[PDB]
Design a protein around this ligand. Structure first.
Ligand code: SF4
Ligand SMILES: [Mg+2]
Ligand SMILES: [Mg+2]
Ligand SMILES: [Mg+2]
Ligand SMILES: [Mg+2]
Ligand SMILES: [Mg+2]
Length: 429
RNA sequence: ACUUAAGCAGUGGAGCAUGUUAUUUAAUUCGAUAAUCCACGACUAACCUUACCAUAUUUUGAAUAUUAUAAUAAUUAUAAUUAUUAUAUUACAGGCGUUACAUUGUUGUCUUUAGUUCGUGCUGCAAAGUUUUAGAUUAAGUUCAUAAACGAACAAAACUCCAUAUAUAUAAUUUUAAUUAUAUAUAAUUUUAUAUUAUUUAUUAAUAUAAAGAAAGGAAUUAAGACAAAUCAUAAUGAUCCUUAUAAUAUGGGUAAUAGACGUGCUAUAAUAAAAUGAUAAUAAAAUUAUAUAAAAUAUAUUUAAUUAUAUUUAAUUAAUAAUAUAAAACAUUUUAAUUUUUAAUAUAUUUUUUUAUUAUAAUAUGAAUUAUAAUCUGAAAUUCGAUUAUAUGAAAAAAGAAUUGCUAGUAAUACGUAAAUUAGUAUGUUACGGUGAAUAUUCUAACUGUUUCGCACUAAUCACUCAUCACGCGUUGAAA
């Protein structure tokens, strides 16, 4: 008789396992890999994996046509999955009705990977005005991107550079905010300034990258640069911030204060004292297509470099920012909401606005034992909390808790609400 | 130089068993997630185990101590004291709560372990160095050589213990396997004599030949780094959290649900291979039996008996004594679809279990999953959810391939079996034990390690330092209508 709350379902993130469009996977396997003997493709894929294995390493533009083949065979799946989950995250937390973008930009090394994901998410009936997609690594990536996009129903405009005469209300960035290990502080600033100028009012910008500690640091720095939390102390809740310009965070951060998990230098994770550090990443599962299963085979990709699965667990970190509309109404609303609204010090245990924009963030796998579930949350109070929900406290609320996973916004109250210790090894750096 | 390349032996498309994953579930107890690949402990999950779900149900509970009332004793003298035993008594006990809660202990994985300190001696003004040598030899630290170096301690080696061959002792050869058993002891790292080729040229290695030999294998045994851990079920202590609940008991359920996905094994796909039979009993080893084992016999399947499975009944043995238990492959005969390569009627023969002549004459008699009936074993209980027997069933499985396992050896393989642990009951799993017993040679590739050469503005040591840029101030000097 006991069932999940509608509030919990609203807070729940998308759960079902991912999968490529059958037409897209069939086309990829039939064309992009059939004409090439598998061994050389596996060799180049092994090279790319080995050169990204280094700690705090980066993705790299496809120099050569063989590298283009390898990237579509190996790395396109996880980019597509990350885009799928982040885009559905945006779609749910802005509401299905309000998410109807018409001017679209995708920026990424691979094919128009956000464009195919957008087509899949908004169905085959969505036909917006502009579907620009700039491709960087190689010119031949455009050809195979056209091969992918032909099977999905072209109007999409495959370019090699950003048009510099138009704004955009949907923008997707895939591994775009940092290209060199050096200049990590504000080269992200440079990139985000370049992409932020072409984002229309009411538009969406969706950033996604690797989800390793270097990744999480890039996300944290980008958020800090955009928001300037230090410029707005004691301002709890989500209000758009100046940066006639205003922007707000949607996900995965349920506040706009300093990130509790941020330590400035990624190299701290490599030391013998930063091995206990924790970074904000998110996990998803995606079914392995045939060409993937046919690829990871042999001593190159199937052995231990010193049972399998039909799916891959991809890690990723991401951000989403919404633009405020340009109008005297919106401007005055922002100014007054900052002026006379004393939202108060959101105390440990506070849910903030008790809506989607401010519900806590599950950032770790909850520990579910008989009669109690423990959750590690990033709360709208700007802090890192540990919330324990017991059956004695409430049966319905415990029932909701035991079905909660990492990456859900858990929307209700708990019995115990203490300061979580995940940031213990942060101040000492 | 791991690992690769080669050679050999395989396994490898199906069914089932057993795991993990996904999904579902009231629960399907617990395990991984920084992009090759990896959530994967089972010496037995029906109940218990059990940790999960549902419903009831217990509240100082498992212990230590305190302070009190009741009985029991012992003493003194009913009372005093001691103890014991209950009932309360509150600190609390308890916790398969937490590693995003840490540190030791350890548990493993990888690298280096002829090398690290110490003491002297010597060289340099000194920081330092300890030199030839960055040597030779071997399959490898297994062995030498040299030189301002030489020592001791650990480590390694030797040594030790197995196995093997012998000697002594022991056994009144009925506990008999004296072909054995277990104590002590010896032996080998084999020793030699020549020939040839190399050699630092003999007082040396490669071989080969001859001689004495039973002599041919094996394990263990140390530290230093570095990574990984919470079924870290390889623990302790501490931190924090629950204290009508995250502690505790009972009933039932679940851990066995299936669209799927991948590992591990068992059974198969027929003739260099399966089936039946083979009583004066072809031939073992290592084990186990007081919380047992179960012999022979009788009876029913069932049928003259045999075999196989239960039932009745306990003979010996608690053991070098009796039982588990007549080891099986091996070997002999017979049969075996595809196969008109066969069987049958007539004749026929110096092939007679046989030959000739004329007519007739894609899944089988492989496979045993699945399904049905009726019985049986354990246990109190076999529905979810065990094993066994008989009578019906009779699926997929044929061709070629990705892929991968192991590699001189009593090893692989074996339609060869035997035994033990866990068990009241269930092994296609694990660990032991013996029987038969092969093949093949290694161009190649190599991370990585060890020495080295050169450079060095770095020294908390390239995630280094220096240089230049951008803003903010404070100064200084030089020209000046
Ligand atoms: S959710 Fe919290 S921990 Fe994660 S990036 Fe945002 S602020 Fe940081
Ligand atoms: Mg029970
Ligand atoms: Mg049970
Ligand atoms: Mg305690
Ligand atoms: Mg418990
Ligand atoms: Mg048969």
């Amino acid at each position: 008789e006991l069932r999940l709350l509608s509030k919990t379902l609203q807070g729940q993130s998308y759960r079902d396992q991912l999968e490529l469009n059958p037409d897209v996977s069939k086309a990829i396997n039939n064309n992009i890999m059939a004409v090439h003997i598998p061994n050389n493709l596996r060799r180049v894929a092994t090279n790319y994996y080995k050169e990204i294995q280094e700690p705090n390493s980066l993705h790299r533009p496809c120099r050569t046509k063989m590298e283009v083949d390898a990237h579509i065979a190996s790395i396109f799946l996880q980019n597509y999955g990350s885009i799928f989950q982040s885009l559905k995250e945006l779609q749910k937390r802005v509401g299905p009705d309000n998410f109807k973008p018409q001017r679209i930009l995708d920026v990424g090394y691979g094919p128009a990977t956000g464009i195919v994901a957008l087509n899949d998410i908004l169905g085959p009936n969505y036909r917006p005005d502009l579907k620009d997609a700039v491709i960087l690594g190689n010119a031949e990536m455009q050809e195979r991107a056209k091969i992918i996009l032909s099977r999905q129903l072209i109007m999409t405009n495959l370019r090699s550079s950003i048009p510099a005469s138009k704004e955009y209300d949907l923008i997707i960035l895939t591994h775009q905010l940092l290209h060199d290990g050096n200049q990590f502080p504000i080269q992200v600033d440079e990139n985000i300034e370049h992409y932020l100028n072409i984002l229309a009012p009411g538009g969406h910008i969706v950033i996604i990258e690797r989800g390793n500690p270097m990744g999480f640091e890039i996300i944290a720095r980008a958020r800090q640069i955009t928001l300037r939390p230090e410029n707005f102390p004691d301002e709890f809740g989500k209000i758009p911030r100046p940066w006639n310009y205003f922007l707000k965070v949607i996900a995965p951060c349920p506040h706009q204060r300093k990130c509790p998990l941020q330590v400035g230098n990624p190299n701290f994770y490599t030391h013998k004292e930063g091995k206990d550090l924790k970074f904000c990443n998110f996990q998803k599962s995606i079914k392995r297509p045939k060409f993937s299963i046919e690829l990871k085979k042999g001593k190159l990709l199937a052995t231990s470099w010193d049972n399998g699965r039909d799916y891959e667990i991809l890690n990723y970190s991401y951000l989403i920012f919404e633009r405020s509309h340009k109008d005297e109404n919106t401007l005055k609303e922002i100014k007054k909401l900052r002026n006379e609204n004393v939202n108060g010090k959101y105390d440990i245990g506070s849910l903030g606005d008790d809506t989607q924009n401010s519900w806590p963030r599950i950032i770790n796998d909850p520990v579910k034992r008989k009669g109690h579930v423990m959750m590690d949350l990033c709360a709208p109070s700007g802090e890192l909390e540990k919330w324990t929900v017991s059956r004695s406290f409430s049966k319905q609320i415990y029932h909701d808790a035991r079905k909660s996973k990492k990456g859900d916004l858990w929307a209700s109250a708990a019995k115990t609400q203490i300061k979580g210790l995940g940031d213990l090894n942060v101040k000492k750096f």
